Protein backbone atom coordinates (compact mmCIF):
# COMPACT_ATOMS: atom_id res chain seq x y z
CA UNK A 1 0.00 0.00 0.00
CA UNK A 2 1.58 3.25 -1.21
CA UNK A 3 0.58 6.89 -1.75
CA UNK A 4 2.71 7.37 -4.87
CA UNK A 5 4.99 5.42 -7.19
CA UNK A 6 6.89 4.98 -10.44
CA UNK A 7 6.46 2.59 -13.37
CA UNK A 8 9.22 2.22 -15.97
CA UNK A 9 9.54 0.01 -19.05
CA UNK A 10 12.37 -2.58 -19.03
CA UNK A 11 15.78 -0.96 -19.65
CA UNK A 12 14.34 2.58 -19.64
CA UNK A 13 15.45 5.08 -20.85
CA UNK A 14 17.14 2.75 -23.35
CA UNK A 15 15.31 0.47 -25.80
CA UNK A 16 13.21 -2.41 -24.43
CA UNK A 17 13.95 -6.08 -25.26
CA UNK A 18 11.80 -8.34 -27.46
CA UNK A 19 9.32 -10.98 -26.27
CA UNK A 20 8.87 -9.62 -22.74
CA UNK A 21 5.79 -9.54 -20.52
CA UNK A 22 6.09 -7.41 -17.40
CA UNK A 23 3.29 -6.54 -14.98
CA UNK A 24 2.91 -4.13 -12.07
CA UNK A 25 0.28 -4.21 -9.32
CA UNK A 26 -0.59 -0.78 -7.95
CA UNK A 27 -2.35 -0.43 -4.59
CA UNK A 28 -3.28 2.64 -2.56
CA UNK A 29 -5.07 2.50 0.82
CA UNK A 30 -8.86 2.45 1.18
CA UNK A 31 -10.59 5.80 0.75
CA UNK A 32 -8.36 6.76 -2.17
CA UNK A 33 -8.52 6.68 -5.96
CA UNK A 34 -5.60 6.53 -8.38
CA UNK A 35 -4.29 9.15 -10.82
CA UNK A 36 -2.03 7.40 -13.33
CA UNK A 37 -0.19 9.54 -15.88
CA UNK A 38 2.44 8.90 -18.55
CA UNK A 39 5.29 11.37 -19.10
CA UNK A 40 7.00 9.42 -21.87
CA UNK A 41 5.69 7.16 -24.62
CA UNK A 42 7.93 5.66 -27.31
CA UNK A 43 6.58 2.24 -28.27
CA UNK A 44 6.32 0.42 -31.62
CA UNK A 45 3.13 1.52 -33.39
CA UNK A 46 0.66 -1.05 -34.71
CA UNK A 47 -3.05 -1.26 -35.50
CA UNK A 48 -4.98 -1.98 -32.28
CA UNK A 49 -1.57 -2.02 -30.55
CA UNK A 50 -1.20 -5.75 -31.16
CA UNK A 51 2.59 -6.07 -31.45
CA UNK A 52 3.86 -3.92 -28.58
CA UNK A 53 1.60 -2.31 -25.97
CA UNK A 54 1.26 -1.03 -22.42
CA UNK A 55 -2.05 -1.99 -20.82
CA UNK A 56 -4.04 -0.46 -17.95
CA UNK A 57 -6.58 -2.64 -16.12
CA UNK A 58 -8.86 -1.33 -13.35
CA UNK A 59 -11.25 -3.74 -11.67
CA UNK A 60 -11.06 -6.15 -14.59
CA UNK A 61 -12.05 -3.88 -17.46
CA UNK A 62 -9.62 -2.12 -19.78
CA UNK A 63 -8.98 1.56 -19.06
CA UNK A 64 -6.64 1.83 -22.03
CA UNK A 65 -4.12 0.23 -24.37
CA UNK A 66 -1.26 2.49 -25.41
CA UNK A 67 1.38 2.33 -28.14
CA UNK A 68 3.18 4.64 -30.55
CA UNK A 69 5.26 7.80 -30.16
CA UNK A 70 3.80 10.92 -28.55
CA UNK A 71 5.03 14.18 -27.05
CA UNK A 72 3.04 16.63 -24.92
CA UNK A 73 0.91 19.46 -26.28
CA UNK A 74 1.59 21.76 -23.33
CA UNK A 75 5.11 22.98 -22.52
CA UNK A 76 3.70 23.37 -19.00
CA UNK A 77 3.22 19.61 -18.60
CA UNK A 78 5.01 16.48 -19.86
CA UNK A 79 1.86 14.38 -19.42
CA UNK A 80 0.95 12.50 -22.60
CA UNK A 81 -1.72 10.13 -21.31
CA UNK A 82 -3.55 10.04 -17.98
CA UNK A 83 -6.18 7.91 -16.25
CA UNK A 84 -8.31 8.67 -13.19
CA UNK A 85 -9.77 5.58 -11.52
CA UNK A 86 -12.19 5.57 -8.55
CA UNK A 87 -10.61 2.31 -7.38
CA UNK A 88 -7.74 1.72 -4.95
CA UNK A 89 -6.09 -0.95 -7.11
CA UNK A 90 -4.75 -1.03 -10.67
CA UNK A 91 -2.68 -3.23 -12.99
CA UNK A 92 -0.20 -2.21 -15.68
CA UNK A 93 0.93 -4.72 -18.31
CA UNK A 94 3.76 -4.15 -20.79
CA UNK A 95 4.42 -6.63 -23.59
CA UNK A 96 6.58 -6.69 -26.72
CA UNK A 97 6.58 -9.00 -29.74
CA UNK A 98 9.46 -10.67 -31.59
CA UNK A 99 11.06 -7.63 -33.23
CA UNK A 100 11.66 -3.88 -33.15
CA UNK A 101 12.63 -2.27 -36.47
CA UNK A 102 13.71 0.93 -34.71
CA UNK A 103 14.85 2.28 -31.36
CA UNK A 104 11.83 2.40 -29.05
CA UNK A 105 12.52 3.71 -25.55
CA UNK A 106 9.27 2.39 -24.09
CA UNK A 107 7.40 4.44 -21.49
CA UNK A 108 7.54 6.21 -18.13
CA UNK A 109 4.56 6.49 -15.78
CA UNK A 110 3.65 7.74 -12.30
CA UNK A 111 0.69 7.30 -9.96
CA UNK A 112 -0.62 9.26 -6.98
CA UNK A 113 -3.35 8.49 -4.47
CA UNK A 114 -6.36 10.78 -4.82
CA UNK A 115 -8.77 11.43 -1.96
CA UNK A 116 -12.39 10.38 -2.39
CA UNK A 117 -14.88 13.12 -1.50
CA UNK A 118 -17.77 10.95 -0.29
CA UNK A 119 -19.83 14.07 0.41
CA UNK A 120 -19.89 15.25 -3.22
CA UNK A 121 -18.55 12.54 -5.54
CA UNK A 122 -21.74 10.48 -5.33
CA UNK A 123 -25.46 10.81 -6.10
CA UNK A 124 -26.44 10.43 -2.44
CA UNK A 125 -24.92 12.02 0.66
CA UNK A 126 -24.32 9.34 3.34
CA UNK A 127 -25.34 11.56 6.27
CA UNK A 128 -28.71 12.56 7.74
CA UNK A 129 -27.42 16.07 8.41
CA UNK A 130 -23.82 17.22 7.97
CA UNK A 131 -21.19 15.32 5.99
CA UNK A 132 -17.53 16.02 6.78
CA UNK A 133 -14.94 14.93 4.22
CA UNK A 134 -11.30 14.37 5.15
CA UNK A 135 -8.26 12.81 3.50
CA UNK A 136 -8.75 9.04 3.38
CA UNK A 137 -12.34 8.97 4.62
CA UNK A 138 -15.22 11.02 6.03
CA UNK A 139 -17.49 11.40 9.05
CA UNK A 140 -21.00 12.60 9.86
CA UNK A 141 -21.90 15.24 12.45
CA UNK A 142 -25.07 16.38 14.21
CA UNK A 143 -26.76 19.64 15.29
CA UNK A 144 -26.77 20.51 19.02
CA UNK A 145 -28.78 18.07 21.19
CA UNK A 146 -28.69 15.55 18.33
CA UNK A 147 -26.55 12.43 18.62
CA UNK A 148 -25.05 10.01 16.09
CA UNK A 149 -26.56 6.53 15.73
CA UNK A 150 -24.58 3.27 15.85
CA UNK A 151 -24.70 3.19 12.04
CA UNK A 152 -22.66 6.42 12.16
CA UNK A 153 -24.99 7.87 9.52
CA UNK A 154 -28.14 9.01 11.31
CA UNK A 155 -28.43 11.83 13.84
CA UNK A 156 -31.29 11.80 16.34
CA UNK A 157 -32.55 13.37 19.55
CA UNK A 158 -32.11 11.53 22.85
CA UNK A 159 -35.67 11.00 24.08
CA UNK A 160 -35.58 7.50 25.58
CA UNK A 161 -34.96 6.17 29.08
CA UNK A 162 -37.73 7.62 31.24
CA UNK A 163 -39.53 4.73 32.94
CA UNK A 164 -42.94 5.50 34.43
CA UNK A 165 -44.01 3.65 37.58
CA UNK A 166 -46.54 6.12 38.98
CA UNK A 167 -50.15 4.90 38.89
CA UNK A 168 -51.24 8.09 37.10
CA UNK A 169 -49.23 10.24 34.68
CA UNK A 170 -49.08 12.34 31.52
CA UNK A 171 -46.73 11.82 28.58
CA UNK A 172 -46.00 14.11 25.63
CA UNK A 173 -43.81 14.09 22.52
CA UNK A 174 -40.60 16.16 22.74
CA UNK A 175 -41.14 19.95 22.79
CA UNK A 176 -44.95 19.63 22.75
CA UNK A 177 -46.83 21.59 21.64
CA UNK A 178 -43.89 22.91 19.60
CA UNK A 179 -42.81 20.74 16.61
CA UNK A 180 -41.17 17.38 17.43
CA UNK A 181 -37.55 16.68 16.39
CA UNK A 182 -36.78 14.89 13.11
CA UNK A 183 -35.10 11.54 12.43
CA UNK A 184 -35.61 10.27 15.98
CA UNK A 185 -36.89 7.26 17.90
CA UNK A 186 -38.51 7.99 21.27
CA UNK A 187 -39.22 5.08 23.60
CA UNK A 188 -41.40 5.49 26.70
CA UNK A 189 -41.98 2.66 29.18
CA UNK A 190 -44.79 2.30 31.72
CA UNK A 191 -44.30 -0.26 34.49
CA UNK A 192 -47.06 -0.83 37.06
CA UNK A 193 -47.68 -3.55 39.65
CA UNK A 194 -49.10 -6.92 38.54
CA UNK A 195 -52.69 -6.41 39.65
CA UNK A 196 -53.13 -3.29 37.54
CA UNK A 197 -53.77 -2.63 33.85
CA UNK A 198 -52.42 0.35 31.91
CA UNK A 199 -55.20 2.30 30.23
CA UNK A 200 -54.30 5.12 27.84
CA UNK A 201 -56.57 8.10 27.26
CA UNK A 202 -56.19 11.18 25.07
CA UNK A 203 -58.30 13.85 23.38
CA UNK A 204 -58.55 13.67 19.59
CA UNK A 205 -57.31 17.25 19.19
CA UNK A 206 -54.20 16.41 21.23
CA UNK A 207 -52.65 14.46 18.35
CA UNK A 208 -51.06 16.04 15.30
CA UNK A 209 -48.45 13.92 13.54
CA UNK A 210 -47.45 14.01 9.85
CA UNK A 211 -50.06 12.33 7.64
CA UNK A 212 -49.52 8.97 5.93
CA UNK A 213 -48.28 8.72 2.34
CA UNK A 214 -50.36 7.90 -0.73
CA UNK A 215 -50.23 4.18 0.13
CA UNK A 216 -51.49 4.56 3.69
CA UNK A 217 -48.02 4.09 5.18
CA UNK A 218 -47.06 6.17 8.21
CA UNK A 219 -43.76 8.00 7.76
CA UNK A 220 -43.98 9.28 11.32
CA UNK A 221 -45.75 6.88 13.66
CA UNK A 222 -46.87 6.33 17.24
CA UNK A 223 -47.31 2.74 18.40
CA UNK A 224 -48.27 1.09 21.69
CA UNK A 225 -46.78 -2.31 22.52
CA UNK A 226 -48.19 -4.49 25.31
CA UNK A 227 -46.29 -7.76 24.94
CA UNK A 228 -47.50 -9.38 21.74
CA UNK A 229 -50.60 -7.19 21.46
CA UNK A 230 -50.14 -3.98 19.48
CA UNK A 231 -51.94 -0.66 19.03
CA UNK A 232 -51.03 1.41 15.99
CA UNK A 233 -49.11 2.69 14.24
CA UNK A 234 -50.96 6.00 14.41
CA UNK A 235 -50.44 9.18 12.38
CA UNK A 236 -52.31 12.10 10.83
CA UNK A 237 -54.11 15.26 11.95
CA UNK A 238 -56.22 14.11 14.89
CA UNK A 239 -55.92 10.76 16.67
CA UNK A 240 -57.35 8.10 14.31
CA UNK A 241 -57.51 5.39 16.97
CA UNK A 242 -59.56 4.75 20.14
CA UNK A 243 -59.54 7.61 22.65
CA UNK A 244 -59.56 5.04 25.46
CA UNK A 245 -57.35 1.96 25.27
CA UNK A 246 -57.48 -0.87 27.81
CA UNK A 247 -54.11 -2.56 27.24
CA UNK A 248 -54.89 -5.56 29.48
CA UNK A 249 -51.27 -5.32 30.65
CA UNK A 250 -49.28 -3.81 33.52
CA UNK A 251 -46.38 -3.09 31.16
CA UNK A 252 -46.66 -0.91 28.05
CA UNK A 253 -44.12 0.33 25.50
CA UNK A 254 -44.74 3.61 23.68
CA UNK A 255 -42.64 4.08 20.55
CA UNK A 256 -42.58 7.34 18.57
CA UNK A 257 -40.64 7.22 15.29
CA UNK A 258 -40.03 10.16 12.95
CA UNK A 259 -38.17 10.46 9.65
CA UNK A 260 -36.00 13.28 8.28
CA UNK A 261 -38.59 15.78 7.02
CA UNK A 262 -42.10 16.96 7.88
CA UNK A 263 -42.76 17.65 11.55
CA UNK A 264 -45.99 18.62 13.29
CA UNK A 265 -47.31 19.69 16.70
CA UNK A 266 -46.93 16.21 18.18
CA UNK A 267 -49.00 14.42 20.81
CA UNK A 268 -49.94 14.37 24.50
CA UNK A 269 -51.53 11.48 26.41
CA UNK A 270 -52.53 10.33 29.88
CA UNK A 271 -52.32 6.86 31.44
CA UNK A 272 -53.76 5.41 34.64
CA UNK A 273 -54.11 2.04 36.33
CA UNK A 274 -57.25 -0.10 36.38
CA UNK A 275 -57.56 -3.30 38.44
CA UNK A 276 -57.38 -6.73 36.79
CA UNK B 277 -12.09 27.00 -42.95
CA UNK B 278 -11.64 24.12 -45.42
CA UNK B 279 -10.54 20.95 -43.61
CA UNK B 280 -7.39 19.09 -44.65
CA UNK B 281 -7.46 16.09 -47.02
CA UNK B 282 -7.49 12.50 -45.75
CA UNK B 283 -3.87 11.59 -44.99
CA UNK B 284 -1.61 9.21 -46.94
CA UNK B 285 -1.65 5.46 -46.32
CA UNK B 286 0.65 4.19 -43.56
CA UNK B 287 4.12 2.65 -43.99
CA UNK B 288 4.36 -0.94 -45.22
CA UNK B 289 4.34 -3.69 -42.59
CA UNK B 290 7.56 -4.91 -41.00
CA UNK B 291 9.43 -8.11 -41.89
CA UNK B 292 7.69 -11.34 -40.95
CA UNK B 293 9.04 -13.66 -38.26
CA UNK B 294 11.78 -16.10 -39.23
CA UNK B 295 10.53 -19.40 -40.67
CA UNK B 296 10.31 -22.70 -38.77
CA UNK B 297 13.40 -24.88 -38.31
CA UNK B 298 14.25 -27.65 -40.78
CA UNK B 299 14.63 -31.41 -40.26
CA UNK C 300 -7.73 27.76 -42.28
CA UNK C 301 -9.56 24.50 -41.62
CA UNK C 302 -9.29 21.66 -39.05
CA UNK C 303 -7.09 18.56 -39.51
CA UNK C 304 -8.08 15.91 -42.05
CA UNK C 305 -8.86 12.27 -41.15
CA UNK C 306 -6.18 9.56 -41.01
CA UNK C 307 -5.32 7.58 -44.14
CA UNK C 308 -5.86 3.84 -44.75
CA UNK C 309 -3.38 1.10 -43.82
CA UNK C 310 -0.22 0.54 -45.88
CA UNK C 311 0.83 -2.53 -47.85
CA UNK C 312 1.56 -5.95 -46.33
CA UNK C 313 5.13 -6.36 -45.07
CA UNK C 314 7.82 -8.52 -46.73
CA UNK C 315 8.18 -12.20 -45.80
CA UNK C 316 10.60 -12.89 -42.94
CA UNK C 317 14.03 -14.59 -43.04
CA UNK C 318 14.41 -18.36 -43.41
CA UNK C 319 14.36 -20.55 -40.30
CA UNK C 320 17.37 -21.92 -38.35
CA UNK C 321 18.70 -25.48 -38.56
CA UNK C 322 18.20 -28.56 -36.37
CA UNK D 323 -7.11 24.83 -46.27
CA UNK D 324 -6.27 22.73 -43.21
CA UNK D 325 -3.47 20.22 -42.49
CA UNK D 326 -3.73 16.85 -44.24
CA UNK D 327 -4.70 13.96 -41.96
CA UNK D 328 -2.12 11.90 -40.06
CA UNK D 329 -0.68 8.99 -42.05
CA UNK D 330 -2.59 5.72 -41.76
CA UNK D 331 -1.63 2.72 -39.61
CA UNK D 332 1.29 0.58 -40.79
CA UNK D 333 0.64 -2.44 -43.02
CA UNK D 334 0.01 -5.94 -41.70
CA UNK D 335 2.87 -8.10 -40.40
CA UNK D 336 4.75 -9.93 -43.15
CA UNK D 337 4.29 -13.70 -43.45
CA UNK D 338 6.79 -16.05 -41.81
CA UNK D 339 9.81 -17.12 -43.87
CA UNK D 340 10.48 -20.59 -45.33
CA UNK D 341 11.71 -23.53 -43.25
CA UNK D 342 15.48 -23.84 -42.76
CA UNK D 343 18.44 -26.22 -43.37
CA UNK D 344 19.40 -29.15 -41.11
CA UNK D 345 22.62 -29.48 -39.10
Ligand SMILES: *[C@@H]1O[C@H](CO)[C@@H](O)[C@H](O)[C@H]1NC(C)=O
Pocket residue numbers: 158159160161162
Ligand atom coordinates in the same frame (compact mmCIF):
# COMPACT_ATOMS: atom_id res chain seq x y z
C1 LIG E 1 -30.39 10.14 27.09
O1 LIG E 1 -30.85 10.72 28.31
C2 LIG E 1 -31.03 9.77 29.37
C3 LIG E 1 -31.59 10.54 30.55
O2 LIG E 1 -32.94 10.93 30.33
C4 LIG E 1 -29.71 9.08 29.69
O3 LIG E 1 -29.92 8.08 30.68
C5 LIG E 1 -29.13 8.44 28.43
O4 LIG E 1 -27.84 7.90 28.69
C6 LIG E 1 -29.03 9.48 27.31
N1 LIG E 1 -28.51 8.89 26.09
C7 LIG E 1 -29.11 7.89 25.42
C8 LIG E 1 -28.41 7.42 24.19
O5 LIG E 1 -30.16 7.38 25.80
Ligand SMILES: [Ca+2]
Pocket residue numbers: 018044051052096097098099100101
Ligand atom coordinates in the same frame (compact mmCIF):
# COMPACT_ATOMS: atom_id res chain seq x y z
CA1 LIG F 1 8.33 -5.01 -31.13
Ligand SMILES: [Ca+2]
Pocket residue numbers: 031115116117118133134135136137138
Ligand atom coordinates in the same frame (compact mmCIF):
# COMPACT_ATOMS: atom_id res chain seq x y z
CA1 LIG G 1 -12.31 11.36 1.86
Ligand SMILES: [Ca+2]
Pocket residue numbers: 210219220258259260261262263
Ligand atom coordinates in the same frame (compact mmCIF):
# COMPACT_ATOMS: atom_id res chain seq x y z
CA1 LIG H 1 -41.77 13.41 9.37
Ligand code: NA
Pocket residue numbers: 009010011012013014015016104105106107
Ligand atom coordinates in the same frame (compact mmCIF):
# COMPACT_ATOMS: atom_id res chain seq x y z
NA1 NA I 1 12.33 0.70 -22.25
Ligand code: NA
Pocket residue numbers: 173174175176177178179180264265266267
Ligand atom coordinates in the same frame (compact mmCIF):
# COMPACT_ATOMS: atom_id res chain seq x y z
NA1 NA J 1 -44.09 17.70 20.11
